[PDB]
Design a protein around this ligand. Structure first.
Ligand SMILES: *[C@@H]1O[C@H](CO)[C@@H](O)[C@H](O)[C@H]1NC(C)=O
Ligand SMILES: *[C@@H]1O[C@H](CO)[C@@H](O)[C@H](O)[C@H]1NC(C)=O
Ligand SMILES: *[C@@H]1O[C@H](CO)[C@@H](O)[C@H](O)[C@H]1NC(C)=O
Lengths: 140, 123, 151, 50, 50
């Protein structure tokens, strides 16, 4: 649905199907300017989404399951797997987070004698957990 | 424990790239030996494939922009049981080849707490 | 098979607090020592009575030569501050055949049992458990006092 | 908590000159951090953080 | 007759040496942190994601 938010009560300015009438697991926000979105359907099917006008230059998008952490790349109006990382059978991915973008203030943490340790700023990071039974090993 | 490493085009085939072996010599120390590495022309963006017959098969574990003067440090990762857990690659300036290192998990602190004192019974 | 059973009662009698709700305070049990269950036992209870009884039961146990099972109970109140704030539970076999109960009064962030090498270490304080385990609010600050006031 | 630093040495900007180097992540010639970690003892069970 | 200026100058030395060089020196590396360059890591990539 496309809905018009106004100071008055809204109006449903559009309803329509997606390209394939399939059940959807989630949606990941792609670029504001390019007006793209990525839809992950259950059955693990990924759909590029060109919604409306709203009236090399690679893009990388990355999604998680308990089976693994996968990573995905979009080029040429198509999605391709870029790599995979599944935990083994006994294992199970548990907890995940990405790097929220940050406006920058200080490139380094200082010391008493005006000395500086240069905190590590790499933007392309995520962190995650693995828990494995009988090992009793929370791996970070 | 033999590993075979190969880049693939992901449409044509997995074209082989190298072969390595993993031996557990000491009580608790594994190590890698490069039985052979087969270098051919490499340039551009490629997806990697790693397979140890028996235990492990990571078909697409990484993706890098590769070059024929291979100058990478190949971190294979192990754990308390002497079993391969992961395979990944980083860039190190000094190798002019592929050299591989086995890695143990760099165990966490288990940071301290207050302890019971020593004969605070009659003292 | 013989089981354990925790008996206890938070008083709310020395206090005159009787407009309390009884649904915002929760005791919780965990197992640490000598357990063969491929997961330590755990549980959570609510109150039983206005005078405040709480009770766990069907507790698994170790059996044989002075076989110990280490439970830990978390006395807390989200409306009060409970003076114990941590409880140790010790469940050993007698050579007579009966199972001995002992509990202790730890506090947040100290080891429970000594470090296996200290000669003659200090021992935690036990508490009289004939009637029940008797948990209490803080004498001096019974209220949790979330609200800081200016001035 | 783990805290990620360019160099654990007291004064070092490891490979972060930026005038025109224009590092590539896709290739993998980026710097790699050193880390320092600690943990803490907490009274109550934590569901979720942000 | 230049003894008066030679004599007086060291009294300018003593304050700068003893107290202004306590923590208040320019030209040491900790004073250029506001002026430190913003490291460019991607510069052609976005990494939208979950
Ligand atoms: C647990 O059992 C072992 C024997 O398997 C014994 O040495 C130990 O004292 C027991 N208690 C604890 C807390 O480990
Ligand atoms: C208990 O401990 C006593 C300590 O003297 C020991 O003699 C006995 O064998 C143990 N057995 C049981 C069943 O508790
Ligand atoms: C029999 O068990 C009781 C507790 O149930 C204990 O107090 C007593 O000492 C035991 N008998 C002997 C002879 O130790």
């Amino acid at each position: 649905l496309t809905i018009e938010v106004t100071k008055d009560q809204p109006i449903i300015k559009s309803r329509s199907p997606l390209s394939e009438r399939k059940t959807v697991d989630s949606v990941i926000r792609l670029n504001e300017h390019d007006h793209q979105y990525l839809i992950k359907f259950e059955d693990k099917d990924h759909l590029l989404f060109k919604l409306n006008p709203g009236k090399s230059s690679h893009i990388f998008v990355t999604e998680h399951d308990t089976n693994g952490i996968y990573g995905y790349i979009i080029e040429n109006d198509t999605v391709k797997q870029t790599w995979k990382k599944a935990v083994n059978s006994k294992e199970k991915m548990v907890a995940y987070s990405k790097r929220e973008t940050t406006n920058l203030n200080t490139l380094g943490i200082t010391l008493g004698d005006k000395s500086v340790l240069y905190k590590y700023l790499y933007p392309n990071l995520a962190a995650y957990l693995i828990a494995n039974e009988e090992h009793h090993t929370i791996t970070f | 424990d033999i590993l075979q490493l190969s880049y693939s085009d992901d449409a044509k085939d997995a074209i082989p790239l190298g072969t390595f072996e993993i031996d557990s010599t000491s009580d608790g120390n594994v190590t890698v030996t490069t039985v052979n590495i087969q270098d051919v022309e490499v340039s551009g963006e490629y997806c990697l494939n790693a397979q140890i017959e028996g235990k492990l098969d990571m078909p697409c574990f990484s993706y890098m922009k590769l070059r024929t003067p291979l100058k990478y440090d190949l971190i294979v990762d192990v754990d308390e049981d002497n079993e391969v857990k992961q395979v990944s690659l980083s860039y190190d300036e000094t190798n002019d080849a592929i050299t591989a290192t086995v890695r143990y998990p760099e165990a966490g602190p288990t940071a301290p707490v207050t302890k019971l004192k020593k004969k605070t019974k009659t003292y | 098979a013989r089981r354990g059973t925790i008996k206890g009662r938070l008083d709310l009698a020395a206090s005159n607090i009787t407009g309390f709700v009884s649904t915002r305070t929760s005791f919780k049990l965990y197992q640490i020592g000598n357990f063969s269950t491929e997961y330590p036992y755990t549980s959570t209870t609510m109150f039983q009575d206005d005078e405040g009884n709480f009770e766990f039961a069907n507790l698994p146990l170790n059996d044989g030569v002075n076989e110990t099972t280490y439970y830990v109970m978390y006395p807390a109140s989200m409306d009060f501050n409970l003076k114990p704030n941590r409880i140790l539970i010790e469940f050993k076999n007698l050579e007579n055949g009966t199972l001995q109960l002992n509990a202790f009064k730890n506090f947040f962030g100290r080891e429970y049992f000594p470090s296996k090498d200290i000669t003659y270490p200090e021992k935690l304080q036990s508490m009289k458990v004939h009637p029940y385990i008797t948990v209490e609010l803080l004498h001096k600050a019974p209220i949790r006092s979330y609200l800081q006031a200016r001035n | 908590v783990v805290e990620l630093y360019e160099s654990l040495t007291p004064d070092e900007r490891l490979s972060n000159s930026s005038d025109n180097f224009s590092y590539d992540p896709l290739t993998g010639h980026i710097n790699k951090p050193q880390f320092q970690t600690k943990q803490f003892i907490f009274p109550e069970i934590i569901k979720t953080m942000s | 007759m230049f003894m008066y200026i030679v004599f007086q100058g060291v009294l300018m030395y003593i304050g700068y040496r003893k107290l202004n060089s306590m923590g208040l020196i320019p030209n040491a590396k900790g004073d250029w942190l506001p002026w430190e360059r913003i490291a460019h890591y991607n510069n052609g990539l976005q990494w939208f994601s979950d």
